Amino acid sequence: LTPTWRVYSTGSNVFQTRAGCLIGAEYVNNSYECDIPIGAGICASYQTSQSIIAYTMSLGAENSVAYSNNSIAIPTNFTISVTTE
């Protein structure tokens, strides 16, 4: 169906996902912030020359609390924040 939709050739590798088959985007192992949500944790964005790339979403920045059996952290400063809603 839609015979005109040849979608050129396999210039960009076809990436197979659980949602389906995506043609026209190149998979990368780098994790970036989501731009266009494809689904199942995969998002696509326009970046660097310039092309459309597909990747795996990152939950957030890693952290590790320095826990100890005698230790506490107390602030020495404060910040006043104004937010909209």
Partner: protein
Amino acid sequence: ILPVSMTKTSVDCTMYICGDSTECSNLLLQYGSFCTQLKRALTGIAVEQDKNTQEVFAQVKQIYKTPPIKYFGGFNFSQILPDPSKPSKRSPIEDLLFNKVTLADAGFIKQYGDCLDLICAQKFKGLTVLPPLLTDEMIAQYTSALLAGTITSGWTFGAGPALQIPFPMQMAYRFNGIGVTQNVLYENQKLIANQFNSAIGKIQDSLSSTPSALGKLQDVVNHNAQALNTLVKQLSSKFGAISSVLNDIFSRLDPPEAEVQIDRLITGRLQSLQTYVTQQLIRAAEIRASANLAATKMSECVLGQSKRVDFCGKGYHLMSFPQSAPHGVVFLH
């Protein structure tokens, strides 16, 4: 137990109503755009489900980790923290809940290659399922990060930077927050730890037992399945026509009245689709309201200590623990 999201579905009117019939496509074209509203509504519903999941679960900007040593003032959280000895980094209680909920799900299958039989056979009838944006191992990672933050930092990580604190010290200050002096904990720590361990084990026994209390999550799945089954069975309705098959109508009838015969069939099936869409939107609204309540409960019981009566459990609230469930969430108060 609180529902969070539901299944994302898409329906193709042209193929569902008139499967492989060009004459039907030309005749449906005279009705204008009778399918954009349904497609737009379904896309909005799917986006709403994804947004609901993101608001409920994505509340921390950092992925905290627990120290390798699992000694917290004598308390044992080994039955709720994930273990790396499984492909799914899930707690034993999480595994029990998923095993209990999995009698029916969407199938887990979305490649469509292995379909040679309820979903993919309905796939030939324009009922597909879109995958959730967050997989269960990312929802699990979110829950594990939230649990780690709560055990280590307490309520400090929910309003800025995570601040470390000994676990007995956080319990003593939390007790002081409800009108009980901290010497009570410092003198009955062993008894309190024993009671907590026994209570957790009884939680495991309660869930592992037969009287499944997870009816709220099962009701949504059952309703969706039954609605889809009714819609697919509705294709057999005659709607006043001599027959329910378009090919048969074209072969056995001349155009002059075949036009109205199919117009009647189109009207009946379009009415069925609009009714189904209305039912889906109403259920989407109730599920979204439930999601909003769940979000309020997470933010007010998990991220802090609540003074509201009978809001986070029954009695005098101390803390709550989140666990992930299929299209839902489970709290331990």
